Design a protein around this ligand. Structure first.
Ligand SMILES: Nc1nc2c(ncn2[C@@H]2O[C@H](COP(=O)(O)OP(=O)(O)OP(=O)(O)O)[C@@H](O)[C@H]2O)c(=O)[nH]1
Ligand SMILES: Nc1nc2c(ncn2[C@@H]2O[C@H](COP(=O)(O)OP(=O)(O)OP(=O)(O)O)[C@@H](O)[C@H]2O)c(=O)[nH]1
Ligand SMILES: Nc1nc2c(ncn2[C@@H]2O[C@H](COP(=O)(O)OP(=O)(O)OP(=O)(O)O)[C@@H](O)[C@H]2O)c(=O)[nH]1
Ligand SMILES: Nc1nc2c(ncn2[C@@H]2O[C@H](COP(=O)(O)OP(=O)(O)OP(=O)(O)O)[C@@H](O)[C@H]2O)c(=O)[nH]1
Ligand SMILES: [Mg+2]
Ligand SMILES: [Mg+2]
Lengths: 476, 84, 476, 84, 84, 84
């Protein structure tokens, strides 16, 4: 039995609104969330992060186009169900408002957790830790190249935590950082339904081994960290989701990102004089092998008149297919066990046309390739500068965080004051709860210290990280 | 869309783990004609060049394909260290 | 009789959709407009224009907050009318969708026509022309300090056009430039209802004299240029608006901008370490003379937790007042003759609290004041560089625009190629329609040349104009 | 919110136009106690210091207030050039 | 290869010298079909639009062509100031 | 006024020298109420947590206080390596 009232949850974690609410006040709850998200520092920082080129689109302008495509898929789904007189049977009679708002806010904050420089900024964090923790040596019985005495295998009940911590710390993902940023750092206090829309994958970050064949697609990438294990269980209990299951509305957000994947970059390439509009049209004609979508736009223009109709032509052919795919496989999506994506036909083959042209003529440009190598060097250097913070002992770091005026560590104390206050407050709150008289305190303390170090690096704009790296090396 | 760093790291770790038993792995990758999915072929053989076994995996997603390759390599290592 | 079906027009100017449409396909028309506006080059350029400070808000981030406030005023108005069972009587039974979309798109593109450097960039254009045209000498019978022979008073039927052209060219306004940019330059081809939402004022740019006392507020600033006189008449005929009248939905957009006027700048000041959160709270307490709005937020936090609740507290007190004011004075707003704004009570006095603190502690900072003087110098210098283009004759400029390879004007031809292609195409289309064998051709040609020069300057980002000014002066 | 450039230019033009008749204008501006609207007072007198007339205008908007001041100055100029 | 600055300056000086007698000059320039030389046509007429005379000059060099145009303009000015 | 680098280096060297005998040192520092001099307390104990001895030093100068702490640590090391 499909019932969307058991999925759309308007409760919160702190100061949750209790009691019965009418249809009007329920809508007011989902508008304050919109006000919180739009006026948040995390969204403002998106305009200083680059998509491909450093009139070019940024991540803020890119996420605004994904938000428009999501609205349109939700509206098509809602209108198609009313024709079949299934809106009342599915529980969506008094929930058409929040249904689109949740999709729109999930599409907006789908890239808030990406580190500076993007993909190559994500790899640099992973390799640097991989050399200090050596996760591959903790898979089996004690062998050990670990550089930390407390995390070296030596004690069956304590080795499982050691290997979990060692595996988790070498798996940094932007989607997993998005949940942590929205709950622990920013403290936005969003509704349960809103948080579930940004849970793209369900594989834990500490997972080592083979995933079940029933969920081999939903667990292809890490979804959340170990420090959020208690928060994810409460979310699953609140939204009635089984283990390793997905929220129904996450599928619509995934399809919106796939539509707006390369089309914007092709337009941005023309504005940088990589090629001309006629050259791009010839390249598309050669790669295709189009008439209804591309040819209609070509004869209707010349630069700001070719893409403006191509986007409409491809939307009018892709959105109904996505709506029909969502509607057809409804029980599996509602259960959360659908192991496929909405988008092997003429529709999916069309996206590969834009995919192949972009990787060959835009992503291979020398200027794009150079920035990828420079970004990898910047992140590696920043982690080496803060390495003395990770080499201290528990007592020394406790004295540093408590006294703030230490006469024994002049270099280490000055590096400590450069960290943002929110990250330090999060660290203090996290370590202010573990049992002090336990044989697990050093391990958790080291894990939280590493997480605190990782939060500071990933919360920077590309431009700020470069400036800080150049200044800390006595170059600028 | 692009391959995740952790999957590549795990694939390399499995390759080195099986290389620690004086073995070798050849890698081939291509795109099929009509199945609309990428194909990767692996061959396991010793240093002298005597082929032991081969496998081919087809999938349209990079992450799943690499995970399947990694777990097949791990199973090969497990079976080859059960005896010999 | 109030009937919103006669105001919400879904027709276009080119390739207009004809025939009867249902409620579903009508909504699809207002979504393509949203796709066009969001994916337009004019909106992308808003992220490179500064609001006050060059994590700070830009014009794109500012217009996104105004869009959220507008949504919320429209939703409150729509919900309040349903309680009185007036939705069907007013014709809004099948138009609740486009009603909010029009307001949301009008709030989004409410600053697309502002010149670089803002207010002081607007003055610099006006003074430079005022010295070349001397509009005050054409008010009465022939006297003449005009620097153009064709625009000097000498011929009663031809002097009226001369004085109209001389007065219009010295009145550059961003709102008047918004209509021209959306129709003639970008060629977006929006619906009539969407264009009417960005017509803030109704005074013609060539108006000289005293305005009627019945419209002394709606005609306080210029609304449109002389080159759009034919387009505005068609718009008035399409939307059933009398002379010097306003569109009903424009009032909601005006109230949204007034709410988000200084609150963001106060938050941006703290992020630049002008003062601290406690200092700002003390300043607000001293200036106020608050408990329900500011005190509630102060005790609920500390930087990203004070404004997040202050905004909610002020919205919950300001939005219902605006909705009630809109509903009470409905016949006058529908007729378009309401000579007041929605926002003399405790509500209007609260905004002055934020107004007075911002002008004394933020707008008076030395760094803000310096950028205002530098911007005035940059725009004046750019107009002097292109002055030789305005000194040519009709035949010489015609040869320049036709041949493009002139051996008699080496300096003038090279300056001509720096202008954008869209502005040149607009000029060609405009002059390709006037009767050649008329005694009015030189005057119209000079007016269109001046408009072409003004379009190029106002379509720049602050950062691009500075770089071009420094490069053209052989400094960089 | 801020005063428009054209209104200030028109006000200055009217001031100079009346100054061309060897006259002068004094300008005063303040904020009223409870009417919640700005007030501007103008006085017209000749060079010798003999006051001719004065006026005061109250409004909460800058644009309307300046337009009223400008049109009052224009009416004063018109009346003073009708005779003398 | 390109036109020299002095020739253009002399051409403009002659144009202004003849313009000082309330006259006007129209300028046309093109490339001929098979003669392989550029052509420039000049027309002299007064302000009222009454055409006086025209001339056309053909040459493959810019410098010589402009000098011929300048000296023809000077001869026109001389003849038109001999009388009237 | 500030602590000299050499004194801190000697203090750390003594701490490591005594740490080479599988021992540990806890450090506490504060300011006294009315004596107008900083106080530093040291405690020496083994890895199992059995406290051996403690000491407290008071002085208004950092250099002298750190030298006293260092020489007390050296005496502790000497006494603890005389036997055991
Ligand atoms: N420089 C560069 N940018 C790329 C490339 N492929 C995609 N992009 C850009 O990155 C965007 C998508 O990021 P991807 O790394 O492909 O993956 P993703 O969507 O972030 O991944 P998930 O979170 O797993 O869904 C595209 O819209 C492009 O703007 C590439 O090869 N090189
Ligand atoms: N530097 C500076 N910025 C200001 C000042 N007053 C307002 N602003 C900024 O400009 C915004 C509003 O612009 P205004 O020039 O006041 O007027 P406006 O809203 O553009 O005007 P209209 O189009 O006539 O409604 C405010 O939200 C501030 O961000 C000021 O005195 N100095
Ligand atoms: N930027 C630019 N360079 C040119 C142009 N025409 C020619 N050149 C360059 O200048 C060289 C010849 O100079 P010109 O000015 O054409 O004439 P010239 O040979 O110096 O002239 P003489 O001394 O009279 O023979 C060519 O070989 C080109 O390198 C042009 O239109 N623009
Ligand atoms: N940056 C910084 N400067 C300091 C500090 N303390 C003192 N100073 C400056 O350095 C001056 C004194 O230097 P100190 O290092 O304190 O010592 P000193 O007087 O040079 O030392 P002696 O030669 O042993 O007497 C003061 O007058 C300050 O100008 C501090 O903590 N930080
Ligand atoms: Mg995306
Ligand atoms: Mg605004």
């Amino acid at each position: 039995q499909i019932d969307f009232r058991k999925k759309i949850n308007w409760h919160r974690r702190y100061r949750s609104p209790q009691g019965v609410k009418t249809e009007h006040e329920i809508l007011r709850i989902f508008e304050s969330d919109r006000g919180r998200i739009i006026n948040s520092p995390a969204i403002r920082r998106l305009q200083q992060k680059t998509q491909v080129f450093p009139a070019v689109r940024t991540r803020l302008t890119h996420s605004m186009e994904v938000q428009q495509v999501g609205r349109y898929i939700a509206k098509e789904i809602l209108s198609r169900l009313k024709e079949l007189k299934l809106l009342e049977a599915y529980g969506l009679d008094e929930l058409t408002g929040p249904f689109e708002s949740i999709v729109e806010m999930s599409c907006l904050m789908h890239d808030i957790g990406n580190p500076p420089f993007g993909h190559f900024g994500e790899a640099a964090i992973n390799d640097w830790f991989r050399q200090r923790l050596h996760p591959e040596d903790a898979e089996s019985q004690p062998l050990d190249r670990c550089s930390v005495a407390a995390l070296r295998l030596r004690e069956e009940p304590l080795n499982e935590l050691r290997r979990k911590i060692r595996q988790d710390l070498c798996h940094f993902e932007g989607n997993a950082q998005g949940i942590r940023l929205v709950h622990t750092l920013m403290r936005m206090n969003l509704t349960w339904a809103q948080v579930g829309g940004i849970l793209k994958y369900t594989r834990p970050a500490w997972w080592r081994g083979e995933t079940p064949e029933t969920h081999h697609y939903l667990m292809k990438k890490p979804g959340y960290y170990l420090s959020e294990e208690a928060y994810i269980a409460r979310l699953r209990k609140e939204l009635n989701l089984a283990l390793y299951s997905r929220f129904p509305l996450t599928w619509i957000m995934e399809a919106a990102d796939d539509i707006s994947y390369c089309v914007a970059d092709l337009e941005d390439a023309v504005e940088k004089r990589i090629f001309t509009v006629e050259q791009l049209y010839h390249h598309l004609h050669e790669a295709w092998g189009f008439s209804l979508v591309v040819e209609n736009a070509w004869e209707k223009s010349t630069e700001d008149q070719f893409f403006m109709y191509l986007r409409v032509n491809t939307l009018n052919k892709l959105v109904p297919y996505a709506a029909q795919r969502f509607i057809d496989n409804l029980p599996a999506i509602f259960a959360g066990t659908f192991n496929h994506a909405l988008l092997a036909s003429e529709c999916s083959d069309l996206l590969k046309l834009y995919k192949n042209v972009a990787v060959k003529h835009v992503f291979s440009h020398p200027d794009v390739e150079r920035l990828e190598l420079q970004g990898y060097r910047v992140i590696s250097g920043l982690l080496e500068i803060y390495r003395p913070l990770l080499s201290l002992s528990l007592s020394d770091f406790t004295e540093l965080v408590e006294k703030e005026r230490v006469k024994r560590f002049p270099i280490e104390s000055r590096l400590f004051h450069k960290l943002s206050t929110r990250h330090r407050l999060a660290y203090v709150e996290a370590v202010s709860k573990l049992p002090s008289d336990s044989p697990e305190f050093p391990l958790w303390e080291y894990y939280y210290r590493c997480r605190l170090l990782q939060d500071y690096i990933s919360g920077m704009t590309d431009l700020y990280a470069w400036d800080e790296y150049r200044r800390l090396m006595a170059v600028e | 869309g692009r391959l995740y760093s952790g999957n590549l790291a795990a694939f390399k770790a499995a390759t080195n783990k099986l290389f620690q038993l004086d073995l070798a792995v050849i890698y081939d990758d291509w795109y099929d004609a009509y199945t609309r999915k990428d194909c990767i072929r692996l061959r396991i053989e010793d240093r002298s060049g005597n082929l032991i076994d081969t496998s081919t995996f087809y999938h349209h997603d990079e992450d799943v394909l690499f995970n399947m390759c990694t777990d097949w390599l791990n199973h090969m290592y497990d079976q080859l260290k059960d005896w010999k």
